[PDB]
Structure formats: structure tokens, C-alpha cells
Design a protein around this ligand. Structure first.
Ligand SMILES: [Mg+2]
Ligand SMILES: [Mg+2]
Ligand SMILES: [Mg+2]
Ligand SMILES: [Mg+2]
Ligand SMILES: [Mg+2]
Ligand SMILES: [Mg+2]
Ligand SMILES: [Mg+2]
Ligand SMILES: [Mg+2]
Ligand SMILES: [Mg+2]
Ligand SMILES: [Mg+2]
Ligand SMILES: [Mg+2]
Ligand SMILES: [Mg+2]
Ligand SMILES: [Mg+2]
Ligand SMILES: [Mg+2]
Ligand SMILES: [Mg+2]
Ligand SMILES: [Mg+2]
Ligand SMILES: [Zn+2]
Lengths: 129, 104, 86, 48, 60, 123, 155
RNA sequence: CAAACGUGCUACAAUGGCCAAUACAAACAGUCGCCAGCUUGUAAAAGUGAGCAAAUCUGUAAAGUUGGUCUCAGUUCGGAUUGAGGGCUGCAAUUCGUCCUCAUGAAGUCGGAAUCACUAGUAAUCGCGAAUCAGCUAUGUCGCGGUGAAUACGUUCUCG
RNA sequence: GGUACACGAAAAACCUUACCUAGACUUGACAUCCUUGGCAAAAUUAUGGAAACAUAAUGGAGGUUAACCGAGUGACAGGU
């Protein structure tokens, strides 16, 4: 009985596969060791942020497939993906996970550049005199 | 019975969207009224080109409007057609806007 | 800069006059509008009147001026002194 | 005490003028405008 | 000096690099859209009348 | 040090020491370094006579650093003794290539000699 | 003229020593938008602190930052000539924020070597109330004490 | 071009310079074009040459991670200027194209009085693409994504 | 001034180009209306040419003049 979750953040998909196991979780991202797929700049804890405060002793085998974005965006996708898979095993977990706001799409994406402006919200220097 | 055309790959593209859906409905209805197994009317990504034009005639480059032109695209591949379908394919009359990429 | 395979460049109108003018002993200034023609070894010894834009400035080519462009040894604009604004 | 001279330019550039003059006398009016050709249509219903 | 330049642009030049693109409706030389052969200020008038199929206003 | 009249820093690696010579930059220094086979990252102070002769020989084979200054000097004189407009432009201490001279190009004009902008009492 | 109070974004608990404040100072030393670089620099300084002070780095950091934290804040209020200052009690959130800003500002000006050792020295130099950030806090406190009279009038 | 101002780029550096290995985008564009691979070349590029009328083929992602080195110097910073040799486009590169290689190494060590923008994927910053275009020191313009902050107590003052 | 100054110009070597110096033209490089014929304009090769332009050449798609190629012709074309 596996579980599936689909997270997204900054145009980055995520396919998280939750498999019941009792021989250590063995976190895995895109068939590669997390310490090598990510700059291992301590970003690994973030994805596990909702999998820590509840538990990881249940040794859920993680099968992550992420295609798109940079590396923090990919990390954001799997946290939501981990949480969406978590919403099929013990619907109580949802309540406490909802609290910390770890069950909401961040809704934050890069704005479009506007004409006459040096960026999304920047604007040229103004000279009066 | 014959085929005379294996893997007829019809490709659709048009500047408009609603006409494109209409043409796919008409194409599918005729081709299913004859004995052909349609793979399916799949959508392809729409190539969008955007041109930026300054509104003012002489000065004020800052005030510049924008225009877009979308090339909506669809794919449709027919397995076996035969004369029974091909002869009925002659009376389809595709609205001008829709563009065909028949590849045989 | 200029490629190798291409080589040098003369308009071949300047080249034809120079060949004709070198054979003739009593050479006189050659009126050429081609500031684009590079100075070829055969040009040596002749004198040309390059169009600066207004007049024809006379240049006497030597065995040393060889290689650059014929218009490079003449000017086009002139600036020699400003004037106090205030 | 002088090792004659190892400069003087000319010689090297002389080959360059010869190359340029040979090109100029070679010049063939091969004026053209294009590259790839054919495969230019918008299709139909193969007979409408 | 407009009419003479328009006629000369239609006529073929003696060098390939001598050929430039001028708007086909008016005679404006700069800011010509090769995708449409129409300058920026004729493209606005034409786009606001519906003559060019598919050029709608953009919202992005 | 000992290489001609140049005094390469003694506490600095050889590949940078060669750059300190006038006629030898960095890329050409590496060419001499690789050609002589002497391994880089070897502080010049911790180097032996066997390398000091080979490096000198290849440097002598290349263009002498002292002759380059007179080579550039003859070339400017060569350009000015022809009467070229480029020579004239180099002559009056101005940009020799196509650089603009309206509001910029002060690296060849030294410090600014502020004059008096026009007087505008309005019109 | 606004009548609205701005919201506040989360501070985040630190990922190592679980001391929020570490993330704030990381963001303070941020330059060129490099999260990675800043974490490395800062974290390296705690390791240098271990090698030198033989004590827990979080405890030393709190002892430095808590000691640097000011109490009074002087707000400029001009009427006719110059400005008569007004001492006011700063909130707790701004207290930590101002402390961190000064710590970073005097750290990127020390005569030391790589900013790892530079920033490491400033914090260890501030745990004993003898440094550059301390002097700044001392100066503003003395200025407020001198201008105690106008504290009653604010605006 | 004796000068002055405006808007930007590059810097004055170890949050960095150089070298090696290496992970992760979105959007757009393309048959006088995109050009894979291969051969030659210190390199810009040349020759051969498939593939792609395109969710198929092509347009190397960089910051970022690790390792080595520099050890704070007007320097392995900074790249101006200048000399020479090459490559591409084009009849044609001197006036007046840009790229590469070599050579040189101006000023500049945070900038006076005074000023500008910005309230989250925003400021800052790193690359990518397109338009006009044979080519173009567009560092410009219009777009796309990677990393990603700080602060807002309040209307006494300031501008509208 | 704010509301000009990487603005018109989303590409000034030739072209662009509207400027200057020169070499050439006059119902004109382009157009209509009128009396009138079409048995061409191109492009390119020669010579003189800075190139405009001239003198000689293959005399040219076609469709009998459709479009244009012209003659005659004054109203006029043309002006960044
Ligand atoms: Mg007009
Ligand atoms: Mg220039
Ligand atoms: Mg800009
Ligand atoms: Mg380093
Ligand atoms: Mg594939
Ligand atoms: Mg200095
Ligand atoms: Mg540098
Ligand atoms: Mg040049
Ligand atoms: Mg310094
Ligand atoms: Mg706001
Ligand atoms: Mg910047
Ligand atoms: Mg105004
Ligand atoms: Mg011109
Ligand atoms: Mg006939
Ligand atoms: Mg007839
Ligand atoms: Mg008028
Ligand atoms: Zn127009």
C-alpha cells in the first residue's frame, strides 16, 4: 500500500512515493543520494520539516522524482509532495500539519517584467533638475 | 478491404482557439462515422509570439503597448483510413483559419 | 584584421590607371576618388589626389607608406582651436 | 657586430598583396541570393 | 524627399548590402517589423481594426 | 634576482615572477615554463642554478624585454614619419582607434582642465 | 497617513543550534543574494570559536549579542535649529535587529584577515564588553543620558 | 572636442581572483536559419557533415557544491590605453565594424555638499532568449527563470 | 523642469540620410488625364568612366495589348 504526493513551487513538479518499510527511511531524490543532488547546504532538513515533528521512525521509503526549477524550488516541491502523500496515511496527521501551515501551496512565483521598468518592481532613476 | 495509407498524422494549427476545437469535433465525428480507430485529439503547446510597439508617434518611449498572436496546435494520428474514410474526407470543408499539416 | 584568403583590395580602376601611368614616363598626379584602395607595391613612385571630401589632397607614395589604405594618408575633418564660451 | 638586418617588412606583406591581386584577377560573377530551396507550401485536404 | 526613396527601395540595387526594408503602407524606414512588413505606427492602426488575424491585446 | 636587469620578487612563485619582466606577460610566461619543463608552484628562492640558465636561454630566444620599448618607440616614429592621419591622431595625444572624444576618453588626456560653460540668462 | 500596521514574516528557528537569531544574522551578513556563502562564512566562525574559546558557540554568541543589545534609542526631532533628541524605549524585536546590524557593520571593517576570522574576532571581542560594537552602544546610551530632559516631550 | 550634465556598465577585492571536476531552470527562436558530432587550430573560427519546418533536432546555463592556490600587496585586484599577429560579415572595416591571441598595465583602496529606487519571490544579484540586424564595445530595449533578503514604531517634520 | 537627455533611432562604414563638396537630369526617379502606336523593360557582357551615365551587343516574360513599353502633349508630378 504505497502513497503518492504531488507538490509544486516555482514551476517545479514533484512525484513523492511513500512506501511502508521498517529498515530505515533511506531518503532518496531522483535516484540519487540527497547529499549529492543538493548542495547539501543544510537544505535537506527543510523537506523533512513536516516528516520530523511527527515522526520518521516509520521508515517510509521515499521515491522522489523532481523535474524542473533550481534546488531550493525543488526542495519546496518535495516538502509539499511529502505532505500530500502524508494526507493518505492517518487523516489525523492532517490537523496538526494544517496548523503549522505545511499543507498550503506557497502561491509565490516570480513576477513578470514590466515595460519602462528595470525589473518586476524596480524603476529607472528619477532626475528632477 | 484496403488501407493505402498507414499512420496518417493530421496536425492542426490556427490563430484562433474556438474554431480549432470546432474543427476537431467535426473531424472526429466524420472519422468515427467511418470505421477508423482514432488515437485521440491531443493538445500541443501553443507557440505565442509577442510584439512590443511604442504608442506615441514621436517621443515618450516609456509608454509602449503590447500585442500577442497565439499559434494554437493540435495533433491527430489516424491508424487506417481506406477509401471509405478518404472519400468522406473530401467533403469536410475546414474553416479557413484552421491550418492542416497532413504528413501521410 | 582583413582575412588572408581575400588578400588586399584595390578597385582595379585605380590599378589599371597605375599600370598605364607607370609605363608612361611623364607621370602627373593621378586623380582617384578611391580612398578604399590599399597601397600596392607597384603604386610606389606615383602621386595621387585623394578626395578629402572637398578638394584633392596630393600624396606622394614611397617604398615605406606601402600597406595601409590610400585614404588613410589624407584628412577629412579639421579642428585646431576652441573658443571661450563665457 | 651587426648581423646584417633581420627587418624591412615588405616580404611578408608582399605575399599578402599577391594573394589579393590573384583574387581580383580571378573574380567570377557568381552573384546569387539564397541557400536551401523547395519544401515551401501550406498543404490542403490532398484534394479538398 | 519621400516618394523618390520609396520608388528606389522597390528597385533592385547594384549591391546586395544596399537593400533595406521600408514599410509597405507608409514610407517610414526605421522601426520596420520584418514579421509583418509594417512599421510600428501602421501596425498599431491595422491591429486596432482587425486586419491582421490573431493580433489581440495582451494581458500576459 | 639574476635574470637580466629585472629583480623578480624572491618570495613569489616563478610563473608570476616571469610576468614581472617587461616583455614577458602571464600566458607567455607559462609557455616558457612548460617548454623548459620546470614545474610551477616552486618558489624562486628555493630554486637551483640548473633552472636559472635554461629559463634565461629561452627568454633570450624570445624577444628581449629591453628591445620592446625601442620597438614600440620606432613604430610610433615609423607611424609619424609616414604622415598618416592615424599618426596625427596619435600625435596630438588622442584616441588612436575609433574611440569617442565628446564626453569621455580622459585616460589619454590626463586631468581635467575645467573652463567656463556658456552663460544662460534665458531666452 | 497610512493607518495600517505592516505584517511580519516568520523568523525561522535555526537549522543547527536551533536559535532563530542565527538565521537573522545570516540574512544581515548577506551580500549579493548568496544564502549559501553567508551560512558557510558564519558557521566557520563558530568552529574557530571552538578552537579558541573552548566553550559552546551558541552560548558565546548569545553572551556577545545580548551584551551588545542597547536599551535607549534617540529619535531626531527638529523644530527650529538643529535637532533636540528624544530617548525612547525600543521594542524587543528591534533590539536584537539593531544589535545584529552593528555587529556586522563593525566586523566588515576590522584590520583582520578573511571575514571568517574577522567576524569571529568581533563576537569573541564582544563577549567581554570590550570592542567596537560596545563603544557604539556606550555612545548612544551616554547621549540619551545627557538628553534626559527632553524625554518627556516626544510628539 | 579646451569642456559640463543625465542615464548605465566595469571596478576599487579574500562574501574575492585563477584553475579542475560537477548538479539543478523557464521562456523563446530557427531552412539565405538553428547547427549536433568529427578533423585542424594557443583562439576567435574553417572544412566535412548529419538532424530539425520542430513537445522529436539545435541554441554548452551561470551563480551554486567540493578540491588546489593566492595571503591583503595598487597585488594572481582593476581593466583602461597602446603595438603587433590573426578570424568573421560585407563590393568595401582608414575616416567609422566587432571577436580572438600575444604585449603593456591609466585612474581607482568605497567616493564632498546633495540625492534615487524599492513593502516578497519584492530590493539586491546570476545567467538565458527575442525583436530590428549581412556584421556591429546594445553594457540599450523587451521578456524568462536560479538564489534570495532587511524594515514599516508613527504622521511631529518633508513633497504631492 | 516634474512630463527632454540608452528620447524619435526595434541597429548611421556604402545603403539608411533628411546634411556638405563635387559629376550629371528637366512633364522629370514615381502618377493620372487626354491624340496615338506597340515587333519591351530587365539583367548581363564590352569601351570610356569615381560611379551617375553614354555609346555596341543576346534583343528577349509575354500577349497583340492585358499589365506595361512607349511617342506627342499641356494641365502638372515632386518638397523630410
Ligand atoms: Mg512625408
Ligand atoms: Mg566608434
Ligand atoms: Mg540597464
Ligand atoms: Mg577561492
Ligand atoms: Mg528524445
Ligand atoms: Mg593608485
Ligand atoms: Mg583585472
Ligand atoms: Mg578599423
Ligand atoms: Mg583595502
Ligand atoms: Mg508599496
Ligand atoms: Mg550590480
Ligand atoms: Mg516637459
Ligand atoms: Mg550616407
Ligand atoms: Mg515582341
Ligand atoms: Mg496593336
Ligand atoms: Mg509641404
Ligand atoms: Zn508604416
Amino acid at each position: 500500500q504505497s502513497y503518492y504526493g504531488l507538490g509544486r513551487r516555482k514551476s517545479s513538479s514533484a512525484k513523492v512515493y511513500l512506501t511502508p518499510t521498517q529498515d530505515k527511511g533511506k531518503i532518496t531524490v531522483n535516484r540519487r543520494d540527497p547529499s549529492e543532488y543538493f548542495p547539501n547546504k543544510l537544505v535537506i532538513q527543510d523537506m523533512e520539516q513536516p516528516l520530523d515533528l511527527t515522526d520518521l521512525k516509520k521508515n517510509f521509503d521515499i521515491n522522489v522524482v523532481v523535474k524542473g526549477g533550481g534546488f531550493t524550488g525543488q526542495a519546496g516541491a518535495i516538502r509539499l509532495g511529502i505532505v500530500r502523500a502524508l494526507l493518505q496515511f492517518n487523516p489525523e496527521l492532517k490537523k496538526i500539519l494544517k496548523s503549522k501551515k505545511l499543507t498550503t501551496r506557497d502561491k509565490r512565483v516570480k513576477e513578470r517584467k514590466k515595460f519602462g521598468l528595470y525589473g518586476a518592481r524596480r524603476a529607472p532613476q528619477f532626475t528632477k533638475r | 478491404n484496403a488501407v493505402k495509407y498507414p499512420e496518417l498524422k493530421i496536425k492542426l494549427e490556427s490563430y484562433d482557439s474556438t474554431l480549432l476545437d470546432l474543427t476537431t469535433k467535426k473531424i472526429v465525428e466524420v472519422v468515427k462515422g467511418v470505421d477508423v480507430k482514432i488515437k485521440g485529439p491531443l493538445p500541443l503547446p501553443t507557440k505565442k509570439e509577442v510584439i512590443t510597439i511604442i504608442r506615441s508617434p514621436h517621443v515618450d518611449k516609456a509608454s509602449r503597448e503590447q500585442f500577442e498572436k497565439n499559434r494554437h496546435k493540435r495533433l491527430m494520428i489516424l491508424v487506417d483510413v481506406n477509401q471509405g474514410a478518404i472519400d468522406s474526407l473530401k467533403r469536410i470543408k475546414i474553416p479557413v483559419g484552421v491550418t492542416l499539416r497532413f504528413s501521410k | 584584421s582583413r582575412s588572408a584568403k581575400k588578400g588586399a583590395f584595390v578597385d582595379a580602376h585605380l590599378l589599371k590607371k597605375v599600370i598605364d601611368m607607370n609605363k608612361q614616363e611623364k607621370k602627373r598626379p593621378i586623380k582617384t576618388w578611391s580612398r578604399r584602395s590599399t597601397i600596392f607595391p607597384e603604386f610606389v613612385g606615383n602621386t595621387f589626389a585623394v578626395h578629402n571630401g572637398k578638394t584633392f589632397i596630393n600624396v606622394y607614395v614611397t617604398d615605406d607608406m606601402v600597406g595601409h589604405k590610400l585614404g588613410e594618408f589624407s584628412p577629412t575633418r579639421n579642428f585646431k582651436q576652441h573658443t571661450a564660451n563665457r | 657586430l651587426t648581423k646584417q638586418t633581420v627587418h624591412g617588412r615588405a616580404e611578408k606583406l608582399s605575399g599578402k598583396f599577391n594573394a589579393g591581386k590573384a583574387f581580383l584577377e580571378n573574380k567570377t560573377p557568381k552573384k546569387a541570393k539564397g541557400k536551401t530551396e523547395e519544401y515551401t507550401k501550406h498543404r490542403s485536404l490532398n484534394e479538398l | 524627399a519621400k516618394k523618390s526613396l520609396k520608388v528606389k527601395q522597390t528597385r533592385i540595387p547594384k549591391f546586395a548590402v544596399r537593400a533595406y526594408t521600408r514599410c509597405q503602407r507608409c514610407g517610414r524606414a526605421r522601426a520596420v517589423l520584418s514579421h509583418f512588413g509594417v512599421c510600428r505606427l501602421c501596425f498599431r492602426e491595422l491591429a486596432y481594426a482587425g486586419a491582421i488575424p490573431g493580433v489581440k491585446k495582451a494581458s500576459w | 634576482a639574476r635574470i637580466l636587469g629585472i629583480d623578480i620578487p624572491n618570495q613569489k612563485r616563478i610563473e608570476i615572477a616571469l610576468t614581472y619582466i617587461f616583455g614577458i606577460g602571464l600566458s607567455r610566461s607559462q609557455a616558457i615554463l612548460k617548454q623548459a619543463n620546470i614545474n610551477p608552484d616552486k618558489r624562486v628562492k628555493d630554486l637551483t642554478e640548473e633552472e636559472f640558465v635554461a629559463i634565461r636561454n629561452v627568454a633570450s630566444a624570445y624577444k628581449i624585454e629591453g628591445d620592446l620599448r625601442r620597438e614600440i618607440a620606432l613604430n610610433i616614429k615609423h607611424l609619424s614619419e609616414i604622415g598618416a592621419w592615424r599618426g596625427l591622431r596619435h600625435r596630438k595625444n588622442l584616441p588612436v582607434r575609433g574611440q569617442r572624444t565628446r564626453t569621455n576618453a580622459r585616460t589619454r588626456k590626463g586631468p581635467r582642465k575645467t573652463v567656463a560653460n556658456k552663460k544662460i540668462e534665458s531666452k | 497617513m497610512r493607518k495600517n500596521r505592516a505584517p511580519k514574516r516568520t523568523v525561522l528557528p535555526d537549522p543547527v543550534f536551533n536559535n532563530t537569531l542565527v538565521t537573522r544574522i545570516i540574512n544581515v551578513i548577506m551580500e549579493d543574494g548568496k544564502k549559501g556563502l553567508a551560512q558557510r562564512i558564519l558557521y566557520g566562525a563558530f568552529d574557530l570559536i571552538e578552537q579558541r574559546t573552548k566553550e559552546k558557540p551558541l552560548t558565546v554568541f548569545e553572551r556577545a549579542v545580548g551584551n551588545v543589545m542597547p536599551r535607549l534609542e534617540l529619535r531626531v526631532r527638529r523644530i527650529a535649529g538643529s535637532n533636540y533628541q528624544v530617548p525612547t524605549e525600543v521594542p524587543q524585536d528591534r533590539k536584537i535587529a539593531l544589535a545584529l546590524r552593528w555587529i556586522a557593520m563593525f566586523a566588515r571593517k576590522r584590520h583582520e584577515k578573511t571575514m571568517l576570522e574577522k567576524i569571529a574576532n568581533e563576537i569573541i571581542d564582544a563577549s567581554n564588553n570590550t570592542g567596537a560594537a560596545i563603544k557604539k552602544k556606550d555612545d548612544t546610551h551616554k547621549m540619551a543620558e545627557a538628553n534626559k530632559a527632553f524625554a518627556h516631550m516626544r510628539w
